[PDB]
Amino acid sequence: PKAPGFAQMLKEGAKHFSGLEEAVYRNIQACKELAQTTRTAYGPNGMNKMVINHLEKLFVTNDAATILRELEVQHPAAKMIVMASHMQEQEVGDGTNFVLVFAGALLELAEELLRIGLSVSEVIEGYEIACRKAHEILPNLVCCSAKNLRDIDEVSSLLRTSIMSKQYGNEVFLAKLIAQACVSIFPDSGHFNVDNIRVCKILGSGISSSSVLHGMVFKKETEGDVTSVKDAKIAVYSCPFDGMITETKGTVLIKTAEELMNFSKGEENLMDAQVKAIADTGANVVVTGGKVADMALHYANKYNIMLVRLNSKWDLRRLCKTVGATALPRLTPPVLEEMGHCDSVYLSEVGDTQVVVFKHEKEDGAISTIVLRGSTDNLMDDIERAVDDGVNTFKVLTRDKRLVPGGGATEIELAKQITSYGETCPGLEQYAIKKFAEAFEAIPRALAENSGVKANEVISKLYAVHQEGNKNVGLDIEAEVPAVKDMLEAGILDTYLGKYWAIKLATNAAVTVLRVDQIIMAKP
Amino acid sequence: SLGPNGLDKMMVDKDGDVTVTNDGATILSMMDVDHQIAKLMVELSKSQD
Amino acid sequence: MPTPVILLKEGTDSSQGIPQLVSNISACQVIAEAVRTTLGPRGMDKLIVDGRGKATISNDGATILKLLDVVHPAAKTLVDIAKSQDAEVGDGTTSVTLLAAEFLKQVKPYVEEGLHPQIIIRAFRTATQLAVNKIKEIAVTVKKADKVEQRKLLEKCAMTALSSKLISQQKAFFAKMVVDAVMMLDDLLQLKMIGIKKVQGGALEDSQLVAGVAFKKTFSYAGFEMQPKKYHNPKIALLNVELELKAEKDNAEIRVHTVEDYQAIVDAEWNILYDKLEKIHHSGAKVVLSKLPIGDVATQYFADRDMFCAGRVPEEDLKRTMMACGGSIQTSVNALSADVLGRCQVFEETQIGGERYNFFTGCPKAKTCTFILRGGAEQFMEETERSLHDAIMIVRRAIKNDSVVAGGGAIEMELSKYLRDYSRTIPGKQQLLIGAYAKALEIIPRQLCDNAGFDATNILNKLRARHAQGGTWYGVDINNEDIADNFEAFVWEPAMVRINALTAASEAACLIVSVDETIKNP
């Protein structure tokens, strides 16, 4: 007993995996673990989630990418699909939910065929051809090619889908505010950059009272007065607001008596002259991230100048873009052309928090900010994450075009079409394509499970009503009627590009994970 | 410790020093109490003094 | 020897579903019980000591929850709501927590039924919106009315908010001080202006409101006791720059051949300081304050020429002073002129409890005052300060918004009646949730009466019966131990407090109930 043999001692302590056993069972099981992990995630009936990191920080979340980011995972192909979805989020926004569900379904149905003995490589071929066919057929499903550039109503109606998805209670407010954000931002640095929107979190005064400013905000103090001029003249300085100290170790030296008197006096006088020259161009407000000399702020108070402090490089960049005035590393030249211009700037109190406001009106275009108000900062994290995902959604919309009918309806059409192409495939891969087509039922399935209605006959009725070309009809959200709803009238849409990309990435993740057969694992 | 007929206390410092006194403020100040309301009374006497 | 590959880290705790949710509800209830006793005109406060041994008593629930460092996740949300309400409107943070916990408590039996949480939160959102609208409808202004002084509402608001904290029997006094003080705060409205001064000793009935600025601080230099310490009608000079012999000014090496030149160098340094002092005197002021330390020699000169001075004054109090006497802080002694020179009705510095304080007050145009807060307990200092902070910020909100509602839970009872009646209209699962909403909401009077040791069932029953028809503002009266029109009894709280309370509690319930499982990482 107690002593079997090893024909290979090659490893100093490590995991050798082989024999397709890991691919057939263990890897698939890990993927299904993830699938169950965030099956509840997606859905308007999907309910939120909380997780604490390894460093004990709360994360209330409904987004899948964020929650995957907070689970430090070890099975490799688990990481595969995780980071696949992660990059997908980096590309489109929501769909992390989508792609993870796709991966789970495709893996689960593929292992069944593998058990029924289909060639792994042939499974690869079938899945690839099915994905390509689905890509081919997808554009034929676009409806409501919403084209209005800068209207509020169309974009509000559209962004309602994502906001509703990741927050079911407050569609109207968030829709209107984010739409106000989108219309307020024009193409200035190129086609509605996501980075052009900033988010601030301010606790208290629950969500309904959250508002949006056409300017940009700061949670910092002030040094002199608090004033706004309808013609506010802003000066920006990356350099610290002080006499320019030589980088070289420059020790001031004296030789005779009067040097001390004259040196201190001249320092005073030339700081006075510098700040006066700044005031001469009429600039009433100055901002800098560098250190502020007390002498400088004193003279500024003498000349009724506003000061803003401790800004980080990104912050001053934002402000630069807001007022369109060029930051000046040289303290001297308050040049007229590159000098600030804002509707109004002042200091206000919200939530016992000193707040610097750049309240603005800009026809040429400005990078606006949204103000978030409410009790729980964790809810702020969730809601701002959802808002940013919606902003990404609007950006992707702007990328090209072509809303598609959500609510699974699109995916039911995909299933039907792919299956129909399946029986015209024939070859042993027919099972592969048939199972791939079957896999899309996961989405409506997930919506059902988070909806808590009997999924099977829901899917059946959905199929039946989809046998008449009603490509716009999808899964309802109603306990009274656990049957059906017509998506187009309900306005429950989503983007072509998002679905297309999610499908392709899920396909790539699947083809990668299925492909590997034996594993090697050094000890961590 | 109260009254001309009263009797005073003698304290032992942490560092082994000694002190004889009748002033209640000092009595409680030098005390090493742990129960909180004892601390509250100590601070009481300090404030009153 | 292969092994199964884990999904997450070893010991990664997980707990999913109805047990998880009910555990969270129970945790919220536990948090409630730590604060349940607290609120009430006969309410309660707690004492919590840290691991460091520093005691801390508190009646404001938010402070207590801050002290009770919560580890369980769900309760952290409740404590965060405590911070939110504390930053927003004041007492009732207590009440906020009780509302949250009781909402969860009433819902939990239905959670035992496998109801999808989203139905519950939808009902909650609808109910809360309707409740807020009802409150705003039954809000009461006074500037429409005739028998209101622009302060009487504020005075009664302080009257109401105060009479739960540690100073309850001095409310008739402290309300007058705080209202008159905040009246001076206009129009900056920010708390940093009026400081709070926790002077040791004395009975808090002796606590002082000064129409000016005082210091709990000074520092002994050579002559500080020599100079006269009365200045009847003085001029205030405010220096940020230090006054000392190149103590911490620019660092420089110097080279000098002729000995006489070295003599001249030391003479010139002292001539620097003398020049600064001459600028100070010839300014005509007599009182000088400095953030930075003061040279002893300059103190000597002020003493000889009967100017008062002081050094190292904390910056915040200096800002208070300059805003008070109207002068502007200076860093260049040379640019000095009479314009930036603050003036005060009278200056003094008088002992209080062994400490050496400084006084200057009576400035007719001074938008900032300060509280000298006598009190025999160091713990009273923090507790009274917290209560006063609540008072100040709530009265600020009141000035901002001329909206008042009755106290004593009467608002909550009215909402209960209104919501219950509305529930009849909507059939189905929503009706039960609305009913539970009302049944949770009624808690406030119950806790009040329990801390009052009454049969709150008789009180509640009479309350509902009388409050179906007879008048809006009937509610609990502690001393008469039964219902009264607390509005006429002047139990007046700003609407904003209850409105924000309800909104926060609603979204708290939404958040908590919107959780199915929890993941822990070592």
Short mmCIF file of C-alpha atoms in Angstrom, two decimals, chain C residues 164-385:
data_model
loop_
_atom_site.label_atom_id
_atom_site.label_comp_id
_atom_site.label_asym_id
_atom_site.label_seq_id
_atom_site.Cartn_x
_atom_site.Cartn_y
_atom_site.Cartn_z
CA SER C 164 -33.83 65.95 23.77
CA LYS C 165 -30.09 66.51 24.33
CA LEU C 166 -28.07 67.08 27.47
CA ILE C 167 -29.09 70.71 28.03
CA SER C 168 -32.86 70.21 27.86
CA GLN C 169 -33.74 72.27 30.92
CA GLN C 170 -31.89 75.34 29.64
CA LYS C 171 -33.69 75.44 26.31
CA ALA C 172 -35.55 78.69 26.99
CA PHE C 173 -32.08 80.23 27.36
CA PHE C 174 -30.04 78.52 24.69
CA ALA C 175 -32.72 79.04 22.06
CA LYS C 176 -32.47 82.79 22.51
CA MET C 177 -28.68 82.71 22.32
CA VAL C 178 -28.55 80.51 19.24
CA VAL C 179 -31.25 82.40 17.35
CA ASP C 180 -29.67 85.77 18.04
CA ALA C 181 -26.27 84.33 17.10
CA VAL C 182 -27.33 82.75 13.82
CA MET C 183 -29.11 85.99 12.98
CA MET C 184 -25.63 87.51 12.85
CA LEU C 185 -24.30 84.78 10.52
CA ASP C 186 -25.90 86.33 7.43
CA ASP C 187 -25.32 85.89 4.71
CA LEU C 188 -22.42 83.45 4.41
CA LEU C 189 -24.49 80.95 6.41
CA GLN C 190 -21.52 78.65 6.98
CA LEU C 191 -20.72 77.14 10.35
CA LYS C 192 -16.99 77.86 10.28
CA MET C 193 -17.58 81.50 11.21
CA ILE C 194 -19.04 81.02 14.69
CA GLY C 195 -16.59 78.95 16.67
CA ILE C 196 -17.43 77.02 19.81
CA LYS C 197 -15.25 77.48 22.86
CA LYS C 198 -15.18 74.66 25.41
CA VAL C 199 -14.02 76.55 28.47
CA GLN C 200 -13.57 74.22 31.42
CA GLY C 201 -15.55 74.64 34.62
CA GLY C 202 -18.50 76.81 35.49
CA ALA C 203 -22.19 75.98 35.36
CA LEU C 204 -23.49 75.90 31.80
CA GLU C 205 -26.15 78.40 32.83
CA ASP C 206 -23.18 80.77 32.90
CA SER C 207 -22.14 79.93 29.34
CA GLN C 208 -21.55 83.10 27.39
CA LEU C 209 -22.52 84.46 24.00
CA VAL C 210 -20.20 87.26 22.88
CA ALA C 211 -20.92 89.57 19.96
CA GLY C 212 -17.27 89.26 19.05
CA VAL C 213 -14.33 86.87 19.17
CA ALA C 214 -12.47 85.31 22.08
CA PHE C 215 -9.48 83.01 22.48
CA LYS C 216 -8.98 80.02 24.69
CA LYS C 217 -5.35 80.49 23.73
CA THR C 218 -2.37 82.73 24.27
CA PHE C 219 1.28 82.11 24.89
CA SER C 220 3.67 83.41 27.49
CA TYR C 221 6.59 85.49 26.28
CA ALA C 222 8.59 87.93 28.33
CA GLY C 223 6.39 90.94 28.81
CA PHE C 224 2.93 89.57 28.03
CA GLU C 225 1.79 90.29 31.57
CA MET C 226 3.44 93.72 31.60
CA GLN C 227 1.38 95.56 28.99
CA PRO C 228 -2.01 96.97 30.01
CA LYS C 229 -4.81 94.52 29.32
CA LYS C 230 -7.62 97.05 28.91
CA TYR C 231 -8.12 98.97 25.69
CA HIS C 232 -11.35 100.90 25.71
CA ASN C 233 -11.66 101.93 22.04
CA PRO C 234 -8.77 100.20 20.28
CA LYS C 235 -7.67 99.58 16.71
CA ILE C 236 -6.96 95.98 15.71
CA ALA C 237 -3.91 95.21 13.59
CA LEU C 238 -3.73 91.73 12.10
CA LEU C 239 -0.32 90.37 11.13
CA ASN C 240 0.26 87.01 9.54
CA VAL C 241 3.98 87.68 9.16
CA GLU C 242 6.05 86.72 12.16
CA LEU C 243 7.96 89.26 14.25
CA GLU C 244 11.36 87.81 15.10
CA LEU C 245 15.01 88.11 14.14
CA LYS C 246 15.13 86.19 10.82
CA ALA C 247 13.99 83.18 12.82
CA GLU C 248 12.47 81.28 9.89
CA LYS C 249 12.83 83.73 7.00
CA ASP C 250 14.92 83.10 3.89
CA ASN C 251 18.03 81.02 4.52
CA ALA C 252 21.20 82.85 3.56
CA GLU C 253 24.92 82.72 4.16
CA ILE C 254 26.65 86.06 4.57
CA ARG C 255 30.27 87.10 4.10
CA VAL C 256 31.84 90.18 5.65
CA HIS C 257 35.47 91.31 5.68
CA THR C 258 35.41 94.44 7.81
CA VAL C 259 34.55 93.87 11.45
CA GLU C 260 32.64 97.15 11.41
CA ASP C 261 30.58 95.74 8.57
CA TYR C 262 29.76 92.71 10.73
CA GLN C 263 28.60 95.11 13.43
CA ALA C 264 26.53 96.87 10.79
CA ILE C 265 25.05 93.54 9.74
CA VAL C 266 23.77 92.64 13.18
CA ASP C 267 22.56 96.21 13.60
CA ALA C 268 20.72 96.00 10.29
CA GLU C 269 18.94 92.81 11.29
CA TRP C 270 17.71 94.40 14.45
CA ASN C 271 16.82 97.44 12.36
CA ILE C 272 14.63 95.14 10.28
CA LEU C 273 12.64 94.20 13.34
CA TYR C 274 12.59 97.76 14.64
CA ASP C 275 11.36 98.98 11.26
CA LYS C 276 8.53 96.47 11.37
CA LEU C 277 7.65 97.52 14.90
CA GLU C 278 7.72 101.21 13.99
CA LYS C 279 5.38 100.52 11.10
CA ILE C 280 3.13 98.76 13.59
CA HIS C 281 3.10 101.59 16.12
CA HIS C 282 2.89 104.47 13.66
CA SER C 283 -0.10 102.63 12.25
CA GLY C 284 -1.87 103.90 15.36
CA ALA C 285 -3.24 100.51 16.37
CA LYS C 286 -2.73 99.08 19.84
CA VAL C 287 -3.70 95.40 19.49
CA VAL C 288 -1.69 93.01 17.33
CA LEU C 289 -2.43 89.35 16.67
CA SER C 290 -0.21 86.93 14.80
CA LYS C 291 -0.55 83.44 13.43
CA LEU C 292 3.22 83.22 13.62
CA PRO C 293 5.28 83.54 16.80
CA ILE C 294 6.09 86.97 18.20
CA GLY C 295 9.56 88.12 19.17
CA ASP C 296 9.96 88.82 22.85
CA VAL C 297 11.66 92.13 22.07
CA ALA C 298 8.67 93.31 20.07
CA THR C 299 6.51 92.36 23.02
CA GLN C 300 8.77 94.48 25.19
CA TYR C 301 8.34 97.46 22.90
CA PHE C 302 4.58 97.08 22.83
CA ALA C 303 4.68 96.94 26.62
CA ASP C 304 6.83 100.07 26.87
CA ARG C 305 4.57 101.96 24.48
CA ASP C 306 1.40 100.40 25.93
CA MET C 307 0.39 98.31 22.95
CA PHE C 308 -1.05 94.86 23.50
CA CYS C 309 0.12 91.93 21.44
CA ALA C 310 -0.16 88.16 21.20
CA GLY C 311 1.38 85.46 19.04
CA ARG C 312 0.70 82.00 17.66
CA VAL C 313 -3.04 82.62 17.53
CA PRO C 314 -4.85 79.78 15.73
CA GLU C 315 -5.70 80.74 12.19
CA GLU C 316 -9.42 80.00 12.37
CA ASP C 317 -9.97 82.38 15.27
CA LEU C 318 -7.90 84.97 13.43
CA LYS C 319 -10.24 84.69 10.46
CA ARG C 320 -13.16 85.05 12.85
CA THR C 321 -11.60 88.20 14.27
CA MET C 322 -10.85 89.81 10.93
CA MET C 323 -14.37 89.10 9.75
CA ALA C 324 -15.58 90.58 13.05
CA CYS C 325 -13.75 93.90 13.28
CA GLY C 326 -13.83 94.26 9.50
CA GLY C 327 -10.06 94.46 9.16
CA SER C 328 -8.14 92.40 6.63
CA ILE C 329 -5.26 90.14 7.63
CA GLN C 330 -1.89 91.52 6.59
CA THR C 331 1.44 89.91 5.74
CA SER C 332 3.29 92.99 4.51
CA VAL C 333 3.74 95.37 7.41
CA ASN C 334 4.88 98.07 4.99
CA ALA C 335 1.68 98.32 2.95
CA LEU C 336 -0.29 98.94 6.13
CA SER C 337 -3.03 101.56 6.13
CA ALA C 338 -5.96 102.46 8.36
CA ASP C 339 -8.43 100.80 5.99
CA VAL C 340 -7.36 97.24 6.88
CA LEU C 341 -7.33 98.06 10.59
CA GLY C 342 -10.14 96.39 12.48
CA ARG C 343 -11.91 98.28 15.24
CA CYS C 344 -13.89 97.01 18.21
CA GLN C 345 -16.19 98.57 20.77
CA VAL C 346 -13.95 97.44 23.63
CA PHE C 347 -11.11 94.98 24.14
CA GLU C 348 -10.39 92.89 27.21
CA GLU C 349 -8.83 89.69 28.50
CA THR C 350 -10.38 88.19 31.63
CA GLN C 351 -9.90 84.99 33.59
CA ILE C 352 -12.42 82.19 33.28
CA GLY C 353 -11.64 79.00 35.17
CA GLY C 354 -7.92 79.57 35.48
CA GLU C 355 -7.51 79.92 31.74
CA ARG C 356 -6.30 83.18 30.20
CA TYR C 357 -8.76 84.38 27.58
CA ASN C 358 -8.89 87.43 25.34
CA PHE C 359 -11.99 89.50 24.61
CA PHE C 360 -13.01 92.06 22.06
CA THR C 361 -16.64 92.61 21.23
CA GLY C 362 -19.38 95.14 20.70
CA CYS C 363 -18.51 95.61 17.06
CA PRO C 364 -21.82 96.87 15.63
CA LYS C 365 -21.04 95.49 12.17
CA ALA C 366 -19.85 91.98 12.97
CA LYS C 367 -21.33 89.01 11.16
CA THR C 368 -19.72 86.36 13.36
CA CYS C 369 -19.97 85.62 17.08
CA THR C 370 -18.69 82.86 19.33
CA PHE C 371 -19.88 80.70 22.23
CA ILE C 372 -18.00 80.66 25.49
CA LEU C 373 -19.43 77.39 26.77
CA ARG C 374 -19.02 76.99 30.51
CA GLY C 375 -19.47 73.53 31.94
CA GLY C 376 -18.04 71.40 34.70
CA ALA C 377 -17.58 68.26 32.60
CA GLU C 378 -15.09 67.78 29.81
CA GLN C 379 -17.63 65.37 28.41
CA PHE C 380 -20.24 68.11 28.62
CA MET C 381 -17.98 70.09 26.36
CA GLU C 382 -18.27 67.62 23.49
CA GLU C 383 -21.91 66.79 24.15
CA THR C 384 -23.10 70.37 24.49
CA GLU C 385 -21.03 71.23 21.44
#
